[PDB]
Amino acid sequence: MNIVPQDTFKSQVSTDQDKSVLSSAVPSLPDTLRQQEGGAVPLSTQLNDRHPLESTLKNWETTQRQRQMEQYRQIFGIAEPMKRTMEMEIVNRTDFNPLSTNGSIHRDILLNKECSIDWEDVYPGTMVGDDVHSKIEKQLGI
Amino acid sequence: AGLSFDNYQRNNFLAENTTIVGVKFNNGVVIAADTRSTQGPIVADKNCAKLHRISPKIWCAGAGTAADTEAVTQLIGSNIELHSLYTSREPRVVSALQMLKQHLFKYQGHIGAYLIVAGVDPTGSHLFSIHAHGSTDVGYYLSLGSGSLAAMAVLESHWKQDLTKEEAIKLASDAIQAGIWNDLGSGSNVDVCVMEIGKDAEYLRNYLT
Amino acid sequence: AGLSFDNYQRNNFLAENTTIVGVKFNNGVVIAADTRSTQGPIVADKNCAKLHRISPKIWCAGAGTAADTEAVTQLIGSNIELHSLYTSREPRVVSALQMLKQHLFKYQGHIGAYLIVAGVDPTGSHLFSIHAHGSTDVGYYLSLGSGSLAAMAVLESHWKQDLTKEEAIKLASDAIQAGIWNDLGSGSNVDVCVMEIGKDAEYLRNYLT
Amino acid sequence: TQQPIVTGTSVISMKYDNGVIIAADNLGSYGSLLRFNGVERLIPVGDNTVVGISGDISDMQHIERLLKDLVTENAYDNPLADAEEALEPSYIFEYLATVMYQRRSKMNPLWNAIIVAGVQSNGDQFLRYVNLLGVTYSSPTLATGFGAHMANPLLRKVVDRESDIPKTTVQVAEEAIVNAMRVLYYRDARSSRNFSLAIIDKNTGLTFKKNLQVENMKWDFAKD
Amino acid sequence: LKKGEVSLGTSIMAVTFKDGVILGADSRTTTGAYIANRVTDKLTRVHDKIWCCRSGSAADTQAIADIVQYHLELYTSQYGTPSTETAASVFKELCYENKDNLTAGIIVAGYDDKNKGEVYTIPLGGSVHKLPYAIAGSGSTFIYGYCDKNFRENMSKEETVDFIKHSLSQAIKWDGSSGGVIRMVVLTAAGVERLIFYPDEYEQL
Amino acid sequence: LKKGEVSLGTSIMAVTFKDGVILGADSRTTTGAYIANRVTDKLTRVHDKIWCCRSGSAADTQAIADIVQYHLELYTSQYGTPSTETAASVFKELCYENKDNLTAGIIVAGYDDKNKGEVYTIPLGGSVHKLPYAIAGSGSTFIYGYCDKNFRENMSKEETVDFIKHSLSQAIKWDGSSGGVIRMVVLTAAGVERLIFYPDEYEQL
Amino acid sequence: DIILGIRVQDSVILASSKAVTRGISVLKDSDDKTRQLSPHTLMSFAGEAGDTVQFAEYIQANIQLYSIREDYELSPQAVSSFVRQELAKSIRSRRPYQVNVLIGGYDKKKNKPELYQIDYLGTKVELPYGAHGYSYTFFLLDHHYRPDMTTEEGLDLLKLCVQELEKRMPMDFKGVIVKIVDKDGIRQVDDFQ
Amino acid sequence: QFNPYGDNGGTILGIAGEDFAVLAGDTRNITDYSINSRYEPKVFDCGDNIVMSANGFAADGDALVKRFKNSVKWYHFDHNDKKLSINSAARNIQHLLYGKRFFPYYVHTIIAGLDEDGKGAVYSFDPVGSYEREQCRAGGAAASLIMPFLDNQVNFKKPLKYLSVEEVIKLVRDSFTSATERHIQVGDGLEILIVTKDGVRKEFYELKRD
Amino acid sequence: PSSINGGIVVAMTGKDCVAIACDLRLGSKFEKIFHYGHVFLGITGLATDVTTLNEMFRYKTNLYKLKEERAIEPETFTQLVSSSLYERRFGPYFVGPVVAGINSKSGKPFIAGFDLIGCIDEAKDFIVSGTASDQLFGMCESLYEPNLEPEDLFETISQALLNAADRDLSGWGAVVYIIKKDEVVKRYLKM
Amino acid sequence: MQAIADSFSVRLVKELQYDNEQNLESDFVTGASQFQRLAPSLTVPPIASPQQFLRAHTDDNPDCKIKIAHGTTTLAFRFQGGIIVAVDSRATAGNWVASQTVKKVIEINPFLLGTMAGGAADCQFWETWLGSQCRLHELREKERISVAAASKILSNLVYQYKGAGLSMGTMICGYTRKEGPTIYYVDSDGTRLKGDIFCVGSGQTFAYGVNYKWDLSVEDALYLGKRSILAAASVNLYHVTEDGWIYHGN
């Protein structure tokens, strides 16, 4: 029954937290070349000096959806949130368009956003590793 | 996606080193504003249109951060147009109010837009005030801006329940004129928009001068 | 003349770079204290006399800045002795209270002395509490110090109007003992002073050991 | 959390030969305003445990919800949920202390001081304390807030060591608790004259007394 | 709590009587010393016979009330008319779970066939308390004594109306953030009745 | 105002009635939440039929009261019994001229053959106001309405005693800084009468 | 750390102080503030601690990857543009760090030398001469610089600038390592500044 | 901002003998100038003949001891009930302490036991895991008083190597009695755990309660 | 060479004798112990304040001897030091003083210590001043015994100073005074 | 699908925060996986300013302060016979008795040595971790790791946590067949500096009087290191050759 997103801060850090860009020479350390972030961005700098509204904006829709699911569980039972989550998982799982970033029509229908526009829709948005094969590897988990 | 937070730390490091009225009358609503646009003490424009159109019969006028006001008005107008196409019905002022309120509450007051929204729909005539943090209020006559106190004084002087269209137009014009004369933020002209039930909206640019 | 303010700026520049009770009984008053003297967590002295004599039948015990307490008590004692010689009369507790109150108010709380003053004079028996800023209060039983809450609990448990000398002595000793046991600031011994109307003052050093 | 708004003052408790006694007043304050009268701060869990809570009232109600859910989850599919699989005071305290320390470590604490009192299934007395920092300790007498500074000295004169526990009857302990509550009402500005008390005995079970009032008040020497 | 945010300096009362419950409030909304709205309606309807009044942040309380009304519509689609206790529980959960980010206090007045009129108060922090009558707002502090001297159980409708009118008139008299007209809603088995009283009437009490 | 200074969180009332004036107060002195003295006498006598109650800093008010008593003795040595207005003027001058360094508020109740009982209030700042009755202290805020609904001019002595007792009982009930016994002084042409009421009496009102 | 650079008619001369970290006494004979991006493009950098070295090594790795992939060498202009983009990117989500880079190269398609300077905010300026770290050598450069100066005259001007710098610094300033980029590649002047 | 740390000042002392070890501590638990309890033990038997104490903020020390004991349980489960040596326990505790490098436990930790050769061993830890083996170490409020007493009594004066268990117990008791006489935070009681080849034995003595 | 702030002073009482000792920086003149006939004063803390206090007390003791026609006793000197320290209530000297001596008429040994505003701590066993070593107080507590002979008292105080010096090195020295009713012995320790 | 049902089927576990796998692992509920991480997991306070929190709570009564390594003089230099490392061995005094000699030089492996400066715990922990990484690398590649690779691993590790609060300065010294003898200096600021002579600590200027030539014998180099440490001021000496480090003691 949350309105503003909560529990947004990280509680533990490690040098191998980002499993997708781990170095092959030293698997305990990240691969800075394939990160393509400028080469001078330690993870610790991401723990401080953040805009206070960024976490609220990034997790707003998920928080509203979780509150809706909790209300359904309280009023309708377990089956209703179970079915909503199952439908959303099925739709999101079988969509794989490496050349596009726009969401599916069916996802918008499920989210009741058929005729709704937010700034995420208006503003939806290298040398190394920005190709189809990286997306294939991330999708398949290989 | 969405509004970006990039260069926030960089900008912090670099830093370390108007009269608007709305009046209800017996068969509709009227919104009015001044036309002076300033950049500090300098008058940037002597003829600026401050009345904006959410939908053909729903209009609004804002204060605060000008870019935020324009962007929020346009986004809500797009949502209203899409919703009207989806439902095949005339848009309602209550729907625009709900969208504006929830959008402003989502950003926790960081979008500095303060609005007066007037409109006519199949349910009738409506007038609302909207605050940046997401609170909304209803009223028969409203004022906004740096000249809102003088305009509100005029409105409190000459407002009554049985107002015709002409009386309402004159009252709104007088309130804007008082804000023009007694406030350094206003002064050039008066723009009016009249929304009457069952008729098209009437937009009067430079009604007085 | 008076207390000096020299080296105040120099000291600023360098910086930039106990249980006490008083109980009334039907024919007099009793004051009691503990004997532990500490400098931080270290016990400096296990047998320290905290009961001071303003006049032969007017005694007091203090807390706060120890040097301030001693200096103020001695100054008021000198004034009381001179006044008694001038008037050729036994000093009154009210006079000492007035002198202490006005002296402490003159310094606007910068003299950190908090006192319990008990005494017997030709007008009767008196017990007072004195705050650093100059406020004073009257009471039948009073407590002071870091162990004042436990002592006050004991006093509230076993106090009544018709108290004999022995009952009052036992009650004060029990209050000091509670402060001794339950407070880290107290603990060693109990010093008592009994002032009875028409008799000499009785100073019992280490009444409880 | 991060600030208390509506609060209760203090809870006191002691051990006697055959059980434990706990007590707390019925006031919820709103700063200097004595706003809510009729707040129950002793929560009976099972037939053998009583939990006293001081501090934030909303967090206290959250803890009450947690205790009720704990009882319900213990019951569940257990056939002998009340005969041999009933909750013990030690289990309840262990859960509560774990919660308190975990929420302290999250910088999202519950602003309360909690005393758990009861009798174990083998007849042993249980009396332990936890607070918002997760600090826990046990003693033959326990108190929170102002009571810790005034009730404990009075209660330790009756039960000063472990060997004093077998020598203390229920009547003496109850009288000591009542006198301590009277002293607190005398000297605590956020206290109330109405209080509740709970006796947990290995023979007579749980006795919960409500609507108890401080009596025999010496308001007579103020005339002069 | 937020900088430059609209606050609710109101006077709120809710009294249980023999036939049901009555909820009353003033009609003043101010920004500092300026009166932004002198005819605001503070009686919020979340269900046909479940109403509330709000204190604290206006935006936060409006969002919470909208979510509660949506929740009660969902509940009604399943099990029919909800009880006042259920609405109070939903309000309490929303206020308590978001107390670190939202400032909200709610007085809830309800009627149902089972409980026959109830009042709940949820002050800042999120705790809930059930009371025979409740007062809230900046102007309530001035009528704590008077109400305590003039409330009786099982009063008639007219006596309850008079008690609320007198108490709110005093609250308006002494509180600068309170003023305007007095608005009341009467919830009984017969239905919902709205009442309004004007300054020239209650200022002569 | 000064750091670590004793404040006066009291409940003070002064009521003018047909035969004279009555001044009433509670008897609680607190340091934060701890009650430093539960039987303190707050009725300060500056002349035989001129009494006062103090609020704000205890030391500042005590010093001001002592200076006022000395001033009134000097005045009496010359012209006889002073009027309540003269004492109020001296209090006002002392409070106003030192308002940048001292925090003091005074309620003055007096009787004399010419004016027949008067009440003056000097709040923080040093302004003076003459009133038929006055309330002050942290607990006064809770009885603003009740007093406004229950004061009448030219009441008898018993009615005034009852009014003060009820008002102070409510103030004690709702204010944490107020408690203990209720002490009153009655000033008439007959003389000075002291009264005390205990908690077991006024808590059952 | 101080860096200087002069673009003369047919080459680019880059001078970097062979300084050490503070609080630790070090003996070494290497230029640690210069990375060879390509056989005809050199980069000198100055600023704070290892952030700058991390950035320089990241840039070098990217440019070497491009050279291997295309079997071709990027022009100095493209290299400078890529460096500017990466520097702007690196501070889009963190507090900016002090860094200043001079990129000197010889374009063989145009057959001419080029010199660029990028500051800590990502501002790229094409200059005939530049410097960073100096608290005035600018007037000395202005009075004694011509576009058609040979390598020897540029070296003489650099020596004058070095002497002017050293006249107001302690003996802890060991010296400056000088490198030259021209049509034959990158070489080190082992003789003197 | 909410302050998550506290202080429950106590005193502990670990001494390594020739073929035994002792870890002692005062049983007083206090807050500011108040007494929370007069018998709250701070020295615990963790199994496998290892005694542990974490003096300072009591909640952090309790959490650390709980985590170590659970880890020992899993170590016995996963390694055929192998006995955990004292050096391995010290390494585990170092890792547990350093796991909170940016949100540290506010404790000072002492462990004691027998090494592989049967000699007594004591290990001392800094709040973030830096540890060393020592013959003797005192920690807490009265360490600066306890250490000179032992230094005057013993030579590290009969040598420590030839002292018996009873003599070490007497020395610890005398030092704690002196500290109780001099320090306000020390008193009530003293508890000593002795580790030998036969196991762990507990002894308790009373101290001044004022 | 010019850094002399700080230091320690230890005073102890034996049988019909007292001992007062202070640390000293030696190697390659500034002593913190002074005497005024038969009363010894050791001052720790800021060096300028130490010099100022020594000069002021020499002034006052000389005037006292000229007026009273007799040398000042330890108790009277203690009271004088207390009052002089309290005179600077709001600008106090950054010093910790210790007084030792033997009363001539009675023969009783006397030691005392002061805070920076003159509060008197009269101790029957020993006084430690300075913040150079926290374990110095513990070592003195462990080594002190009541009613020691002058040789035993000297050995005890010297051992305490030596152990304190070893706890915290080159150039350190000590000055020790053993005071009897009629004989005063001053010794230097280079260890 | 039934997993979704379990996620939506029910409070107590949520309050215990044990619904998260990391919390269960940290408290050893499901096993000892916490003691099986090649990259250690470091706890941070879940607030907006962890760095300010740590800095405020570390720079303030009991013995619970973070231990700081000795500021004593340490010297490292390289010659044709290998590397000489010399540390002034003068242990500080406290309320404890040392069981044996205290080592200010960390033995990373039988071929690598590191020097402690700043935070003792940081140096010890991260150099032991570096030894584990080097052992794994040597097992994988079937060859001894070069000094440059190990120093770079440590530098990258400390750079990932730059500004969090770590304080350390170390000298990695090693003799390999390919590189010869090599000395790097790595600190918590991310700097990684190859060198010939390093003097760190108080008195580094006096010890930097190193009479130095690449033809010194082993005995001459040991004597020179001892004399330099004495001039800075017992001395602990280490001689690192291709076959490993040898401890002399003096």
Side-chain angles (χ1 to χ4, degrees), chain F residues 103-138:
Chain F
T103 300
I106 305 290
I107 287 193
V108 183
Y111 184 87
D112 48 7
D113 295 321
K114 180 185 171 185
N115 295 332
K116 299 288 186 179
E118 290 181 340
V119 175
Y120 296 81
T121 171
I122 303 170
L124 309 187
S127 64
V128 68
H129 311 261
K130 181 181 179 180
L131 300 171
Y133 75 94
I135 60 178
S138 56

Side-chain angles (χ1 to χ4, degrees), chain I residues 81-126:
Chain I
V81 168
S82 183
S83 64
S84 295
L85 286 177
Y86 193 80
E87 181 177 5
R88 321 267 291 200
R89 176 55 181 84
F90 307 102
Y93 302 100
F94 287 177
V95 291
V98 181
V99 168
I102 306 282
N103 194 308
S104 291
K105 184 171 181 176
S106 65
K108 293 186 174 182
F110 183 90
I111 58 171
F114 309 83
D115 76 334
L116 82 168
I117 54 180
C119 182
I120 301 175
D121 174 27
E122 186 175 342
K124 301 181 181 180
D125 47 1
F126 59 95

Side-chain angles (χ1 to χ4, degrees), chain D residues 94 101 104-105 107 109 111 128 132-139 149 156 160-161, chain H residues 1-5 29 34-37 40 57 59-60 63 66 103 105 206 209:
Chain D
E94 190 68 21
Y101 183 75
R104 167 263 168 193
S105 306
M107 304 296 296
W111 286 80
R128 204 160 169 86
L132 56 92
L133 294 168
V135 172
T136 66
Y137 47 81
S138 178
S139 196
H149 306 282
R156 286 168 184 171
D160 203 6
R161 300 182 186 194
Chain H
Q1 185 182 352
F2 162 75
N3 180 21
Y5 290 111
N29 192 275
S34 302
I35 296 175
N36 301 324
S37 68
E40 189 70 20
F57 183 42
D60 281 359
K66 199 174 204 178
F103 195 177
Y105 299 108
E206 293 186 5
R209 296 157 63 96

Side-chain angles (χ1 to χ4, degrees), chain F residues 45-58:
Chain F
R45 173 187 180 275
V46 297
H47 208 265
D48 80 316
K49 288 179 180 181
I50 302 179
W51 297 61
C52 77
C53 292
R54 328 188 318 274
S55 60
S57 171

